[PDB]
Amino acid sequence: HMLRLSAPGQLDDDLCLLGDVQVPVFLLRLGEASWALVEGGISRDAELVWADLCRWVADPSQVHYWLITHKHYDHCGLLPYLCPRLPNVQVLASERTCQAWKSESAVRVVERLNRQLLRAEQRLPEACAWDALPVRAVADGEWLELGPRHRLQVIEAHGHSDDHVVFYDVRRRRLFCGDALGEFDEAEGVWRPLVFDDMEAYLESLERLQRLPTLLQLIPGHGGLLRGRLAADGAESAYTECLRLCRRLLWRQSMGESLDELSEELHRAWGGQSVDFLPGELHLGSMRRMLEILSRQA
Ligand SMILES: Cc1ccsc1C(=O)O
Ligand SMILES: [Fe+3]
Ligand SMILES: [Fe+3]
Numbered sequence: 001h002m003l004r005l006s007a008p009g010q011l012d013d014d015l016c017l018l019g020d021v022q023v024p025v026f027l028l029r030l031g032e033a034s035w036a037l038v039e040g041g042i043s044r045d046a047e048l049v050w051a052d053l054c055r056w057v058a059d060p061s062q063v064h065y066w067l068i069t070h071k072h073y074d075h076c077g078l079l080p081y082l083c084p085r086l087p088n089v090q091v092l093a094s095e096r097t098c099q100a101w102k103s104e105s106a107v108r109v110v111e112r113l114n115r116q117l118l119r120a121e122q123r124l125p126e127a128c129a130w131d132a133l134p135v136r137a138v139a140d141g142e143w144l145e146l147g148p149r150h151r152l153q154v155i156e157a158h159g160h161s162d163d164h165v166v167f168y169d170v171r172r173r174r175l176f177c178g179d180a181l182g183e184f185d186e187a188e189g190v191w192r193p194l195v196f197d198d199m200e201a202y203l204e205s206l207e208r209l210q211r212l213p214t215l216l217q218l219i220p221g222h223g224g225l226l227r228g229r230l231a232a233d234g235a236e237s238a239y240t241e242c243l244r245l246c247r248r249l250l251w252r253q254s255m256g257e258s259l260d261e262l263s264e265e266l267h268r269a270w271g272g273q274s275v276d277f278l279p280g281e282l283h284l285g286s287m288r289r290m291l292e293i294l295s296r297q298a
Pocket of ligand 3: 072074075179221222
């Protein structure tokens with residue numbers, strides 16, 4: 001498809017995709033001797049993403065920034081394992097995201113879920129402590145002056161999670177939207193909602209993102225880069241699909257169904273796409289959590 005770029009390697013003049021398209025790390029060329037990373041992946045991909053990075057970046061001390069959308073295990077798992085190899089990097093993340101890395105119980109869940117994705121006999125590299133990460137907290141509305149032609153605005157986009165932010169490059173009409181629009185369905189071309197904290201926040205975030213100047217490139221947390229009408233219509237379409245799922249849930253509950261029937265249907269219909277980075281029971285349980293949130297706020 002011409003509207004979805006979904007291969008490793010160069011995506012635009014300044015932008016490459018590192019690692020696997022299902023849990024990518026994006027590499028921005030900020031200048032002749034300066035780079036940034038966006039999204040923080042899963043821990044087991046450390047040596048893959050490192051190898052890909054080194055194909056493009058001859059001197060990794062030139063990696064100066066690492067932008068992080070949110071605290072989920074699949075968006076920050078690389079940080080302890082590659083930051084020791086990136087001596088000049090500054091991790092840019094929201095206050096709430098930073099705080100999650102200070103919580104011993106929060107760190108435990110991240111580590112447990114990431115270790116469930118290790119291949120047999122696979123060993124992770126030396127790690128620095130989660131609470132020692134070279135982090136600079138960023139605020140809602142903050143302009144990140146990353147390079148002479150790279151200026152990205154932080155936008156709060158809670159609802160998927162209570163810490164989630166997105167990053168908007170208005171020069172390129174390019175939005176790194178993490179999981180705030182949901183999961184893009186590669187077979188059908190629609191958004192699957194991912195509402196795991198707050199439905200009203202999720203929708204309100206999409207309402208605000210729809211007011212941005214028209215997008216040319218929309219880059220979620222999974223599946224690659226979307227362009228053309230998929231980018232221009234993304235926030236609006238994500239909103240619509242979330243309402244569709246709420247109406248579906250209310251229809252079935254009205255027929256006396258338990259949340260478990262639709263949970264299993266959504267796991268059946270939707271769990272295949274993420275099976276290689278979401279450990280066994282986590283997709284089904286995530287679907288149930290989402291439907292619980294939807295049911296309580298509707
Ligand atoms: C892609 C996906 C599917 C169920 S949860 C999730 C996530 O990224 O949080
Ligand atoms: Fe997430
Ligand atoms: Fe995710």
